[model samples]
Each structure stands twice: as C-alpha cells, then as structure tokens.
Target: TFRQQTIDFLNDNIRRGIENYYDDLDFKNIMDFVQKKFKCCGGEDYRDWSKNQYHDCSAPGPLACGVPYTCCIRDTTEVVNTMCGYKTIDKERFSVQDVIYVRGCTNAVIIWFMDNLEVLFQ
Candidate 1:
C-alpha cells in the first residue's frame, strides 16, 4: 500500500532523528517542532529516546533514562524547564503521565499527513 511506504519513510527519518539527538542540532530542532506540533514524544514512544547513548537507561550520567525537554508536558508556557525531562523514564508511566506525552510521534504525524493529503488533490 502507498500508506505503508509513506509510513516507513517517515518512521525511518524520525527514528534516525531521535538517534541523532545530541549530535545534530538541526535534527533535534526538527524533532522538537514535530513532537510539539503532533503532541507526541519519541519516534515509537517516549521509551524510544533510549536509542541515544546519553538517554539510554544503562548509561552512567544525569541524563540517563531521560528525554529532551521538548517532550516534557510543561506546567508554564512562559518558562521552559530544560531539566523537566530528567530521568523521566526511571519512573512508572502513571507517575509521569502528566509530565510528558507517552505516545509516539510516528502515528501522530502520519495520521495528520494522511488526513491532509487532499490538499494535494489539485
């Protein structure tokens, strides 16, 4: 199906962007915008952020088992809490349910894209 091809292409790029986290600011910003606009977390889920070495659950660092602040569900629109995503993965989903989007961006983005495809029907 054409949908399958579209999904795979978008998913692959999203996953690669997630993996490129700290390495590429361009990709990071793109992911941040996409996540916020789509109201999602990682490519597959918030847990997908573990693909990054710094955010992996096993790594030894403050950012271990965490996601970027863009994934955080903010309490204030004015102030950006950069550390809001710190160690969020260490806790249970219910506990952090209000802190971030638990769902993945792949479906969200693709769904939106598919829904708006008619715009191209010129």
Candidate 2:
C-alpha cells in the first residue's frame, strides 16, 4: 500500500511540470526513451500527456491530444512510426486501448515488482 501511494504521488507531481518541460528536446528524448523502454506513457497514465503542449488534447496540430511514440505498442522486429502514439489521446476512452498504454507507470511498476518479488527473495 505504501508503495502504491508513493508511486501515484510521484507520478502526479512529475506530470504537473510537463507543460513547462516539454520544450527541452534533449529532455524529451530522455523521457521518451524511458517511456518507450517501460512501455508507459506520461507519469500516472497516458492522460498525463495532456500536460505536454505537444501532446495536450487542447493543443493544436495533427498530434494534438496524443502521446509520444514511446507509448505505442509494436512488434520489436519491425521499424516503427514515430507518430504511432500521436492523436491517440483524442480517441474514445474505451477505444484508447487500440493505441497507447492506458495504465500508469506507478501501477505498472508496482505490479512488476510484485511479480518479481519471488526472484528478489531468492
């Protein structure tokens, strides 16, 4: 329970600043890589991308209301479209699953930790 709350708190806080931080291309790539690597988008959930101007639902352009490519699901064996996650947030909440990860990293990490606890115990 402690782990869960901490993760949620941290994700929400970090996400709060994305609107200001999205402009740093270098930082964006770093964030994108982590998101891609973890298969997680935003801080708490894909909706968190709304804080980023580039991906904010209220923002303009083709990519509006979308997330970074990092959030997309793909076949590792093939090349990918960098825009895969674009315009995904505008999708219906129920159908959003067709595009990006709906779950937050906080929950994702916790689940992963629990799943692998037996390994650590050994």
Candidate 3:
C-alpha cells in the first residue's frame, strides 16, 4: 500500500507538471519521461500488507520498513530533475526546498514528508 500510494503521488505530480506545461509541451512525452524517471519497481504485491509482518520496531514500521526514505528522496530528486528541470529554482520550488529554508527550519521537512506519506496509505 505504501508503494502504491507513493506511485500514485508520483503519477499525480507528473500529471500536474504536464498539465502546467501542456500549452507549449507534449503531454505524452512528459508522461513518458516521468514514467521512466520515477517508475515504481515494488508494487502492491512486493510487500505483505495483510498483517504487520514487515513492521520493524527499530524503524518507523511502514514509514521506513522496506526501502529507505533516503532512496525515495533520491528518486524524488531524479523526478524533479527530469520532469521539472533540475535548476536551483525548480528544486527550490518543486521539492521541499522552501520547507528546508524556512525560518527556524530543523530538517523537519523530511520527517514531515515521511509521516504524511505514511498517512496516505492509512
């Protein structure tokens, strides 16, 4: 369910980006590029969601159960690069740059994103 939710979020972002640039861009090409860049490998079947089998107490259970959030961040960076063009401005706006730069910021953006992401499946 986490994988599916993540994929859905990625797909939604791709669709949003394409729609934003549709007037001067090819939606199909954008979709193809985003798909290739942020494609999800582990599907719903990849993990056992029926019970709490994969829930590791050392980690945050479903939040950091399987693949690391660092990997997701890396993938998200790639998605930002390919889909939205990896300029400082784009990264600043598309990723969690604003949250990263906010006053009194405490790297909570990553934690917030991860927690909210887990909530999506719940």
CA lDDT, every prediction?
0.83, 0.71, 0.32
lDDT of 3 by residue, 31-115 (tens): 3343334432121211211112222223443332332111123433333222221112113223533222211111222345677
Per-residue accuracy of model 1 over 1-122 as CA lDDT, tens digit each: 98778768877887899888778999989999988888889876788888888889999998889888888886556666788788887687887777888888988977787899998686
Ranking by lDDT: 1, 2, 3
Write candidate 2's Cα lDDT for 1-122 as tens digits: 97677886868655754665566676666566666666777777788878776776776686688776778877556666878777777666568676677776666666778898999886
**Of 1 and 3, which scores higher on TM-score?**
1
TM-score of each: 0.81, 0.71, 0.21
TM-score computed on alpha carbons, candidate 2:
0.71
**Candidate of highest lDDT:** 1
Where does candidate 3 have its weakest 10-residue lDDT segment? 41-50
Q: Which 10-residue span in candidate 2 carries the lowest summed lDDT?
A: 13-22
Better model by TM-score: candidate 1 vs candidate 2: 1
RMSD to native for every prediction? 2.6, 3.2, 16.8
Ranking by TM-score: 1, 2, 3
In candidate 1, stretches whose alpha carbon ends up further than 4 angstroms from where it belongs are 1-6, 75-80, 120-122
